Design a protein around this motif. Structure first.
Motif, short mmCIF file in Angstrom:
data_model
loop_
_atom_site.label_atom_id
_atom_site.label_comp_id
_atom_site.label_asym_id
_atom_site.label_seq_id
_atom_site.Cartn_x
_atom_site.Cartn_y
_atom_site.Cartn_z
N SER A 2 0.83 -1.20 0.00
CA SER A 2 0.00 0.00 0.00
C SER A 2 0.87 1.25 0.00
O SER A 2 2.07 1.18 -0.25
CB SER A 2 -0.91 0.01 1.23
OG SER A 2 -2.26 0.13 0.82
N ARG A 3 0.26 2.40 0.28
CA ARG A 3 0.99 3.66 0.31
C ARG A 3 1.71 3.88 -1.02
O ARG A 3 2.70 3.20 -1.32
CB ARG A 3 2.00 3.65 1.45
CG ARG A 3 1.28 3.49 2.79
CD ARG A 3 2.08 4.17 3.89
NE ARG A 3 2.04 5.62 3.73
CZ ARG A 3 3.00 6.40 4.20
NH1 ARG A 3 4.01 5.88 4.84
NH2 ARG A 3 2.93 7.70 4.03
N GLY A 4 1.23 4.84 -1.80
CA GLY A 4 1.84 5.15 -3.08
C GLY A 4 1.04 6.22 -3.82
O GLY A 4 -0.12 6.02 -4.16
N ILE A 12 5.45 8.80 -2.84
CA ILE A 12 5.49 7.48 -2.21
C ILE A 12 5.29 6.39 -3.26
O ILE A 12 4.66 6.61 -4.29
CB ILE A 12 4.40 7.38 -1.14
CG1 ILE A 12 4.47 8.59 -0.20
CG2 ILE A 12 4.57 6.08 -0.34
CD1 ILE A 12 5.88 8.74 0.36
N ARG A 13 5.83 5.20 -2.99
CA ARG A 13 5.70 4.09 -3.92
C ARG A 13 6.03 2.76 -3.23
O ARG A 13 6.95 2.69 -2.42
CB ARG A 13 6.61 4.30 -5.13
CG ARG A 13 7.99 3.68 -4.87
CD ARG A 13 9.00 4.24 -5.87
NE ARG A 13 9.98 3.21 -6.22
CZ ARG A 13 11.07 3.02 -5.47
NH1 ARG A 13 11.27 3.75 -4.41
NH2 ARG A 13 11.93 2.10 -5.81
N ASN A 14 5.28 1.72 -3.58
CA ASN A 14 5.50 0.40 -3.00
C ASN A 14 4.78 -0.66 -3.82
O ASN A 14 5.09 -1.85 -3.73
CB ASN A 14 4.99 0.37 -1.55
CG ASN A 14 6.00 1.04 -0.63
OD1 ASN A 14 5.69 2.07 -0.02
ND2 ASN A 14 7.19 0.53 -0.49
#
Length: 16
Positions: A2-4, A12-14
């Motif tokens: 998550s988080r992106g 943000i990136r994942n």
């Protein structure tokens, strides 16, 4: 994990 999302003074990136 998550988080992106581009956030001007921050990015943000994942893809998970």
């Amino acid at each position: 994990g998550s988080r992106g999302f581009r956030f001007x003074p921050k990015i943000i990136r994942n893809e998970r």
